[PDB]
Amino acid sequence: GSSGSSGKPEWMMIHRILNHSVDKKGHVHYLIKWRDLPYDQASWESEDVEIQDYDLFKQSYWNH
Length: 64
Fold this sequence. Notes:
- The protein has a single domain, classed as CATH 2.40.50.40.
- Helices cover 16% and strands 20% of the residues.
- It has one helix at residues 54-63; strands at 19-22, 28-32, 43-46.
- It has a 3-stranded antiparallel beta sheet, with no helix packed on it.
- The longest helix has 10 residues, at 54-63.
- The protein starts with 18 loop residues before the first strand and ends with a helix.
- It is found in: Nucleus; Cytoplasm, Cytoskeleton, Microtubule organizing center, Centrosome.
- Belongs to the SNF2/RAD54 helicase family.
- Residues 12-64 form the Chromo domain.
């Protein structure tokens, strides 16, 4: 599955990619909506952040 000591918890989930934005630097960011937290609490997470099935969500939102 997924290994690594320093990464991310289990409670942290990704409801659905609200939107995406590319900072002036270039790094692509994806507005992740922490299922637990509401939409008003949502936060911006770069495309580097390691989250459960993070690559899948990003791949999906894009295709669709």
